[PDB]
Design a binder for this molecule. Structure first.
Ligand code: CA
Ligand code: CA
Lengths: 620, 598
């Protein structure tokens, strides 16, 4: 058919990936050579960020101006890719210029993310983050590539969480730009991708693998809508593209693949219901294309979900503490970003009005309208599914709603300027001035929306026993000695040791296994968190070393061989625990179990005191 | 015109029946399941939000169905069902795990529950606490509540929540009926939903004042139309306004006073607007005002006559203003500002705008008259009128929003969907926040022991769990009916569960003016210093009132009993007083129940 334009599209996407990687590596390497002052205790970084993301917006205006008239038409595209990548990198990695940890440091939720990135760094295979022998549940897409990049190029996996997060976000933005200029004109592509990137950097920043899909949802929604409606010879490239995107998101983020599949099913149903006339021959074509999309998606996404569904087909999984047991305050109320007094609220209101008035006679507007409606239906469905003692995690779809509404708002701004620009001549400069002022006023609020994240990132001890605040380190400065003791006693590589700890930040830095994960929610259902916790709590009612060693040789699972406990309450070794009280708000409840210092009394234990911790290792 | 009147009566009766049926069925279904508590989990707020969204979407569907007109009857029935269901879902879902209304049995719910418990064991009209007195507080809501709680066998402390929710739903349905008789159906639905939402947000703690707060806009407009007309026409709205004032006089005194004030203002303005046109048509509004006033007094006398026939010869010597809701910064502030603009720009050419403008002017005149009357050592309570002001301004804001949408739609046609979208978003964003503005009330409702001895959030109950034992002991020692023995306590939540006559009220501003609260308190403080057991019997029988027979008093230091009533202070009695071989003294926990046996 001589449709080589597919080859050109693949070449453009590969060039986007290469350019984003190059910019995000060079910029970060250059930044990390200056010894900047701490962000929470100096304005040096928050001013250089503003300078950078103003110089990367004036540059975009210049590039868009150049594209309108010029014989180049190719330096404009390269400049656009370079400038969106640089905008993302400067917005994020400049405030984090003196620290080595990502947002939130090693705190509440980064613990298991860093643990899984550390797991997939000393092994190529797919293994669970904590437990031993199990196939992984959480999608190992981002972490596998991060682990390969950290195993190849030196640096430990806790240290390749900031650079790889920023680089992945830059890749997502630079690929979203390539996806937009295939559909709409170049200037509109620049404006829309900059708006969506600026929103994701402010809202889906802490989790740098939901941000990629969050940015790529609008272009892929438009591409699927235009390609599910084609008739009998057209859009078969868009169908395969949407299927590939859903398969890619299956191994990258489960909530967003669920939402995307929901939206695609709604799109196919709406199209099939709409064209129910002209016989049934034309009313089934959207269903055939939906079948093809599903067939590609659940064969690209089965390279990571097959081991789990093969081992969980027979094993007694618990699944009564599922990861979707969060019902926070904002998870019991719909989100209306269109109506909040602020610039984001104004642009979301403009997007809502544009979608309402242009849904029926536009290709992007219809797709974005169906996306927003599916977001709201998903929210209502999760609220209703709380009856079935489960949730659909609808409170993580707020950033997605913001991104969709901001893309529609940029579209509506362009449409309005081009509509009321007929009744006059000097409106493009004034509209550009107002829009640039608004963009500069918003993009300097990114480091201030993320202020708690940056403060936590600057006051957490990294894996070198240092703080990014250049203050005395916390408790994490003893872990090197602890690991040296563990490796000296057992004599086995740290992939073969099972460690029972209460401070789960030891296993984030070091690739030891675990007998109990940090939280009941992000724990493998095959692991039987409840029964492990029951067995652990039973040990509190023991007093003899022989009884304890007999208990440690009767568990169905693999027993701990290294215990990292704390002093407590007149010769008892306290290990803090956790429990899922889901219907209630603090969905997790912490409680303490204590061992009475006589269990670890044999010639078959080696008990040492290192700082506050006591390290009882079972001698081989 | 008997057909019009008969159809109006039929529609009002249908509204009452539909609201009752929907509220009862929904409340029973909700109470069937054992939901988690509100202060801990969020499973009840989520279901409240789902129900509200469903009801609002259904109302939009009904309004759309009205256009394609062949199902007008079904559209009206569905409208009534949906407004009633919206009210019931908004209130009774967060209170799905408890048996107490908002605030439970806290500061002011105690005498409301006490009066509902009074009017359940007897049908006549008597005071809530004191014996042998005619009631002062208007027993309209509580009488029907007592009949409903005595016919179905429910203890009267338990009928409070379902009866309050049902009454509020009935009020909303009747308001909707009045609106689609005055204006077109779609505007009726829209303004009824707006006023109902604001009423639920701000006037729910008092469920018999919210019945009338939601019914002031329709009746203001109806009375304005009924007094404005100058012919043999409009003689039915006059009777309707008179009957509404008579119904409000037995339901809520502050709002009947305010309504009579506003009606007098309306009649005066109408008479003075035609004074220079011949006095023949300048006194017609005054004649219609007199006809309104005769019916209102005739209907209010059935309740206020026993008190006034006794308060005319007895010692009756006892008893946040000026707010601007259109200037606050919220969605409500925006819609109230739009309503104020509409009232300013449309008062002289519209009847609803004129009526609502006169209502708001009356609210502010009342507010500025209360401040002046503070010089007279008294106030008109012009701080419980603020929810009324919010309701009036929101009704005006709904009218102004619709009229502005029409004016904008003169230039183009596609502004209707955009307005509908940004109005539905705002309606949902406000109505889903109602459980959060009532959060302190729900929190108190869930952490209060009910009449069975169990808290709402399944925690160890408080001291309200020994009451059944105290009751059994009293009814066994005295050997008489409950509403025959007078009880002197300072934990007044015992009398708000059981129909025992009291010797003292909670605070002086709840007591019956005929009750002489100050002299009773002085007599108790005189008992404080009494010496021996014989002096107690001597000084009990000299009281001009009915002396107590049962004393329910706690433990105190060094031979005291420490009644600890309020005026707040503490009064204690030496143990010697009850040591006579007449009183039966026994400890039922932290209490010392001393009953003067016959
Ligand atoms: Ca962990
Ligand atoms: Ca009382």
């Amino acid at each position: 058919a001589r449709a080589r334009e597919v080859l050109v599209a693949l070449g453009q996407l590969a060039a986007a990936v290469v350019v984003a990687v190059g910019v995000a590596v060079v910029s970060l390497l250059a930044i990390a050579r200056v010894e900047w002052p701490a962000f929470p205790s100096s304005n040096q970084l928050h001013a250089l960020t503003t300078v950078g993301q103003v110089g990367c917006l004036a540059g975009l205006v210049g590039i868009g101006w150049l594209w309108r008239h010029g014989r180049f038409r190719r330096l404009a595209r390269l400049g656009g890719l370079v400038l969106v990548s640089a905008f993302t990198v400067v917005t994020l990695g400049m405030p984090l210029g003196a620290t080595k940890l990502y947002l939130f440091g090693i705190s509440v939720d980064q613990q298991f993310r860093t643990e899984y990135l550390t797991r997939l760094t000393d092994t190529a295979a797919l293994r669970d983050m904590t437990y031993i022998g199990l196939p992984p549940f959480y999608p190992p897409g981002w972490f596998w590539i991060g682990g390969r990049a950290a195993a190849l190029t030196g640096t430990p996996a806790w240290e390749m969480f900031k650079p790889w997060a920023i680089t992945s976000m830059a890749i997502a933005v630079a690929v979203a730009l390539v996806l937009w200029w295939r559909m709409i004109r170049f200037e509109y592509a620049l404006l829309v991708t900059v708006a969506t990137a600026a929103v994701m950097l402010a809202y889906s920043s802490p989790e740098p693998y939901a941000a990629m899909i969050t940015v790529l949802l609008p272009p892929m929604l438009v591409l699927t809508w235009s390609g599910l409606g084609a008739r009998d010879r057209q859009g078969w490239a868009a169908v395969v593209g949407a299927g590939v995107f859903l398969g890619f998101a299956a191994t990258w983020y489960t909530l967003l693949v669920a939402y995307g599949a929901f939206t695609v099913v709604l799109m196919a149903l709406l199209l099939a219901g709409s064209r129910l006339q002209s016989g049934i021959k034309a009313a089934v074509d959207p269903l055939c294309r939906l079948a093809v999309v599903g067939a590609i998606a659940a064969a690209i996404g089965s390279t990571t979900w097959l081991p789990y569904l093969l081992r969980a087909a027979r094993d007694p999984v618990s699944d009564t503490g599922s990861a979707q047991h969060y019902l926070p305050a904002d998870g019991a109320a719909l989100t209306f970003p269109m109506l909040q007094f602020s610039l984001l609220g104004a642009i979301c209101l403009l997007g809502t009005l544009w979608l309402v008035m242009r849904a029926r006679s536009s290709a992007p507007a219809g797709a974005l309208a169906i996306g927003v409606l599916a977001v709201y239906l998903w929210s209502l469905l999760s609220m209703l599914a709380t009856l079935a003692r489960t949730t659909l995690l609808s409170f993580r779809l707020q950033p997605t709603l913001s991104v969709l509404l901001v893309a529609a708002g940029a579209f509506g701004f362009v449409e309005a300027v081009q509509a009321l620009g007929k009744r006059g001549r000097g409106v493009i400069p004034m509209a550009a001035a107002i829009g640039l002022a608004g963009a500069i006023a918003f993009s300097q609020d990114i480091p201030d929306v993320l202020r708690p994240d940056l403060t936590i990132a600057y006051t957490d001890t990294d894996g070198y026993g240092q703080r990014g605040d250049r203050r005395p380190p916390g408790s994490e400065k003893y872990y090197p000695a602890i690991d040296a003791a563990i490796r000296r006693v057992t004599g086995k590589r740290r992939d073969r040791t099972v460690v029972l700890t209460a401070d789960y930040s030891f296993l984030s830095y070091y690739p030891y296994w675990g007998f109990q994960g940090l939280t009941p929610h992000y724990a493998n259902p095959l692991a039987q968190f409840d029964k492990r916790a029951t067995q652990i709590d039973s040990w509190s009612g023991l007093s003899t070393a022989d009884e304890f060693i007999a208990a440690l040789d009767k568990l169905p699972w693999q027993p701990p061989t290294v215990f990292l406990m704390r002093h407590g309450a007149h010769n008892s070794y306290t290990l803090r625990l956790a429990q899922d009280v889901y219907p209630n708000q603090p969905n997790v409840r912490r409680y303490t179990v204590d061992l009475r210092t006589a269990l670890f009394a044999d010639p078959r234990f080696v008990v040492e005191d290192i700082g506050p911790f006591v390290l009882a290792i079972r001698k081989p």
